[PDB]
Amino acid sequence: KQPIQAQQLIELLKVHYGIDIHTAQFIQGGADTNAFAYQADSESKSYFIKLKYGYHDEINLSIIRLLHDSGIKEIIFPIHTLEAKLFQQLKHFKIIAYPFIHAPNGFTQNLTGKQWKQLGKVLRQIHETSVPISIQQQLRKEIYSPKWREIVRSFYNQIEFDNSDDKLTAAFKSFFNQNSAAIHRLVDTSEKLSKKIQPDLDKYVLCHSDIHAGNVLVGNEESIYIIDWDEPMLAPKERDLMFIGGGVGNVWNKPHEIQYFYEGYGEINVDKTILSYYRHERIVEDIAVYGQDLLSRNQNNQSRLESFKYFKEMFDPNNVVEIAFATEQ
Ligand SMILES: NCCNS(=O)(=O)c1ccc(Cl)c2ccncc12
Numbered sequence: 001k002q003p004i005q006a007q008q009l010i011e012l013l014k015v016h017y018g019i020d021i022h023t024a025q026f027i028q029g030g031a032d033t034n035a036f037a038y039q040a041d042s043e044s045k046s047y048f049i050k051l052k053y054g055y056h057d058e059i060n061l062s063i064i065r066l067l068h069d070s071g072i073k074e075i076i077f078p079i080h081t082l083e084a085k086l087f088q089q090l091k092h093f094k095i096i097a098y099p100f101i102h103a104p105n106g107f108t109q110n111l112t113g114k115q116w117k118q119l120g121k122v123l124r125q126i127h128e129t130s131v132p133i134s135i136q137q138q139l140r141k142e143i144y145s146p147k148w149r150e151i152v153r154s155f156y157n158q159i160e161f162d163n164s165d166d167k168l169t170a171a172f173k174s175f176f177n178q179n180s181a182a183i184h185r186l187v188d189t190s191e192k193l194s195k196k197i198q199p200d201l202d203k204y205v206l207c208h209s210d211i212h213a214g215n216v217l218v219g220n221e222e223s224i225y226i227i228d229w230d231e232p233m234l235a236p237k238e239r240d241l242m243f244i245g246g247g248v249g250n251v252w253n254k255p256h257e258i259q260y261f262y263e264g265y266g267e268i269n270v271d272k273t274i275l276s277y278y279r280h281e282r283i284v285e286d287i288a289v290y291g292q293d294l295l296s297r298n299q300n301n302q303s304r305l306e307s308f309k310y311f312k313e314m315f316d317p318n319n320v321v322e323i324a325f326a327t328e329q
């Protein structure tokens with residue numbers, strides 16, 4: 001169930017990057033976007049290899065270049081290919097090598113105040129980094145699409161017994177009821193907030209659409225990195241800021257770290273109506289995405305196991321749902 005194989009990746013790497021890899025293992029996942037990851041090692045340097053297919057090939061590297069250019073070291077820059085490129089397109093898939101980084105992500109590695117400040121500084125460097133007109137005309141933009149809200153509302157009349165349902169699809173069906181009220185409150189609120197917000201395409205900055213503890217690699221002491229730049233966007237800073245104290249992953253939910261963060265980001269003016277909105281909409285979408293996954297055709301077997309898992313966590317103590325409803329500064 002793995003694309004390339006042993007000596008095959010090695011041959012690929014050596015052909016397009018002129019690197020001599022002796023070992024090249026396959027990793028079970030990482031950040032799935034039709035992208036498999038491998039840890040290829042050279043006589044002295046380890047590399048993180050990524051192969052993209054379907055919802056993979058795009059143009060986000062237009063940002064990491066813009067960001068590297070802007071001078072943000074807290075980003076993992078791609079290894080150039082012999083044709084002097086940052087990737088290697090191959091009829092079937094795309095190759096994107098990175099220097100390998102061993103560093104627990106934020107879900108198993110907390111940040112030191114210092115690091116919390118450093119993150120705040122970077123998120124700011126980024127939020128400030130000017131975006132070329134030609135780049136803006138690409139980046140998706142905050143529209144407040146009810147896409148997600150609507151998909152969730154669909155489920156409502158779809159929760160009931162149907163022998164055509166197995167164990168898993170069942171627990172979910174039930175967990176959904178058991179929390180029926182809370183969920184409607186997320187849709188009806190995300191919607192309500194949606195109306196109270198007067199858009200302003202001028203206060204929109206470059207944002208890492210989904211910057212949670214899962215995408216901060218916490219290294220030695222300054223070696224923090226903000227990974228996953230597949231779907232960056234242009235939105236009010238609150239699109240990113242909502243994660244600080246947001247509780248995603250059941251971490252990043254300790255009020256005192258928020259202070260540390262704004263220290264580096266430099267305390268400014270945050271729209272709490274917008275901040276609150278994102279915390280709600282995000283959960284909606286998650287419910288939407290996970291929902292579909294657990295309703296329809298059990299064809300997505302071995303996946304739906306996790307969807308359900310994450311789905312439930314959202315409701316655990318001091319997790320994203322608790323925090324959203326506890327609308328605090
Ligand atoms: N996360 C612990 C250490 N390495 S890793 O496989 O998870 C990993 C995940 C995601 C990205 Cl983008 C990477 C980039 C470079 N090295 C390791 C990377």
Ligand code: NI
Nearest residue numbers: 068072073077
């Ligand atoms: Ni550099």
